[PDB]
Ligand binder design. Structure first.
Ligand code: HEM
Ligand code: HEM
Lengths: 145, 145
């Protein structure tokens, strides 16, 4: 199942993922926080899953939110680093899904991250072509939920 | 406290952490699995916390163990990257501790990783000086458990 989704990661898709990550991943704190705050802005209901982070309206200044945001970026770093070996990509994605499954986060709920990603890519001038590539990566994770 | 522990990361300790990580972090899959297998070999009592992984003796062939081992290395990568900013290191460490606290992993339990780290370091020609630097980093996490 996850393997089949991974099959959509064509040579061109992996190339766009790597090229865009080279920029996005260069500022994990800044972009990580941008993703989370955008998610909360566009889909307020997702805040229900982050009660532990406290006052998320504080953004970057909120230590717990900042800690979560930076950490989230290292999961993507992990995924990006395993793109050339489907076997490693798959085992890393299934390992990542475990805690999210426990939190009862469905594939549909997880898919809400596509908008924030598209918006962050755009802020760095990466168009639809790149947003589509990332949608495919998110789809691999969705296959594991 | 975690804030006092973070202050123990002096200039040379940070430098030795970076220099050794440059090598160790080069092969996350290889060294990550070596780290876990050494832990299970030297402290069989810890295997109980990893029931979900299945037959841990299979090493690299165990997909779940490989997935976990690779992922563990990105938490260390995270810590190393935050060495420049104590405030970020602390929020990233507390974030990391949440799940380990939920699993009831105590500071004493966590410290058992010092043995495996020292051995992997040694296998790459990094002696006591480096093992001690890493123990200082591990102590920051212990302070948060
Ligand atoms: C590209 C998307 C995402 C990435 C890379 C990501 C990454 C992570 C990582 C690495 C962690 C820490 C390890 C763990 O506990 O699992 C985590 C925690 C968490 N994630 Fe995800 N996640 C993503 C999307 C989501 C979404 C869409 C939701 C909810 C709507 C979600 C909810 C959670 C929650 C509630 C936590 C715990 C937060 C805390 O209390 O510190 N994640 N995620
Ligand atoms: C260098 C030290 C260590 C690092 C960097 C580390 C890293 C991680 C990471 C990144 C995860 C995934 C996120 C999460 O679920 O929290 C994790 C999971 C876990 N860790 Fe730690 N950990 C370390 C030591 C330990 C020790 C010493 C124990 C137990 C004695 C432990 C027990 C666990 C368990 C049971 C899981 C879940 C495994 C699974 O079911 O997939 N960790 N750890």
């Amino acid at each position: 199942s996850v393997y089949d989704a991974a099959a959509q990661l064509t040579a061109d898709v992996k190339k766009d993922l790597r090229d865009s990550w080279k920029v996005i991943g260069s500022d994990k704190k800044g972009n990580g926080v941008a993703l989370m705050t955008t998610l909360f802005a566009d889909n307020q209901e997702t805040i229900g899953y982050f009660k532990r982070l406290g006052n998320v309206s504080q953004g970057m200044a909120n230590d717990k939110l900042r800690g979560h945001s930076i950490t989230l970026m290292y999961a993507l770093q992990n995924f990006i680093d395993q793109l050339d070996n489907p076997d490693d990509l798959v085992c890393v994605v299934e390992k990542f899904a475990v805690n999210h499954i426990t939190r009862k986060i469905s594939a549909a709920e997880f898919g809400k991250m596509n908008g924030p990603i598209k918006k962050v890519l755009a802020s760095k001038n990466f168009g639809d072509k790149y947003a589509n590539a990332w949608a495919k990566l998110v789809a691999v994770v969705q296959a594991a939920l």
